[PDB]
Enzyme design. Structure first.
Site, PDB file in Angstrom:
ATOM      1  CB  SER A 175      44.687 -81.243  50.299  1.00 38.04           C
ATOM      2  OG  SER A 175      44.522 -80.871  51.640  1.00 38.04           O
ATOM      3  CG  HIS A 230      39.507 -81.786  52.205  1.00 41.98           C
ATOM      4  ND1 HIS A 230      40.155 -82.939  51.813  1.00 41.98           N
ATOM      5  CD2 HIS A 230      40.467 -80.842  52.343  1.00 41.98           C
ATOM      6  CE1 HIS A 230      41.452 -82.700  51.718  1.00 41.98           C
ATOM      7  NE2 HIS A 230      41.667 -81.436  52.034  1.00 41.98           N
ATOM      8  CG  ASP A 238      36.136 -86.659  54.625  1.00 45.57           C
ATOM      9  OD1 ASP A 238      34.933 -86.605  54.524  1.00 45.57           O
ATOM     10  OD2 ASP A 238      36.695 -86.838  55.680  1.00 45.57           O
TER      11      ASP A 238
END
EC number: 3.4.21.90
Lengths: 162, 162
Positions: free
Chosen positions: B113, B39, B61
């Protein structure tokens, strides 16, 4: 410690593989039987052992021979106790983890084949056959045996004959 | 303490995901294999890793790639030992309970992330992909792997991409 490691290695009888005055490897007697790295060319530094006819083992690229019982009186002792930690060999210490041996870079090279790995009790847990450069360290290709007496050779992918 | 924990994280080599000079996430190598949050848009701050073609994992993902043996010389160590208690990550400590990671509110946001969660031994137990506001605290969306080798993603319903 490494000092004591060498002292024990000196007590241990080991013989290089001489060819034209050059050591191409090493060979010794464990469990009352002679072993020699097959890829290594030349003869053991011992007329008595050299007088013995060896058998080949292509699968693991090793040769072996039976040693007279009288000479079996004193040979290398193998053990199955292979816990994680550090072990000893000619070139200092070695790190054992995940079932794998690793050492600092620049340690070990072609012609070092045959060097055994000893535990704290001076018992054989593995024999170094080769290795491969792994950056700050190097990964060793070794042979070890299960408690069931199973011969298992561990060789990293595309490991070089050291 | 958090100083000490982050300092150890600083010793660990990490590479942000750069896009137009902006960090949109992080990617690193564990067990000798590269992982990257899918992502997250942009390219890793590492030409060598960027040279690698990745495979996609829609289910999670996530993207991943194989790392050259020479580059595997020093990568992150994962563990399956994930007891309840507290772990360490870039943004300080994290509480682990009920199989979930939780932190004080205001901690973690979009672009974080890729930050792994390490134990006292510096072993990875999970990777943070996102999270969701939970009052005084926040619940993290993470991926972790069981002793059975099972990839498990814990994601709150409608959790935000952090």
């Amino acid at each position: 410690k490494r000092q004591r490691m060498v002292m024990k290695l000196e007590s241990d009888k080991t013989f290089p593989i001489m060819l034209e005055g050059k050591i191409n490897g090493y060979a010794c007697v464990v469990g009352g039987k002679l072993f020699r790295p097959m890829h290594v060319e030349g003869k053991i530094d011992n007329d008595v052992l050299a007088a013995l006819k060896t058998k080949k083992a292509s699968k693991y690229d090793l040769e072996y021979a039976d040693v007279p019982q009288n000479m079996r009186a004193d040979t290398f002792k193998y053990t199955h106790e292979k816990p994680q930690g550090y072990y000893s060999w000619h070139h200092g210490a070695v790190q054992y983890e995940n079932g794998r041996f690793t050492v600092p870079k620049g340690v070990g090279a072609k012609g070092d084949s045959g060097r055994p790995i000893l535990d704290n009790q001076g018992r054989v847990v593995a024999i170094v056959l080769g290795g491969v450069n792994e950056g700050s360290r190097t990964a060793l290709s070794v042979v070890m045996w299960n408690e069931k007496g199973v011969t298992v050779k561990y060789t990293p992918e595309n490991c070089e004959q050291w």
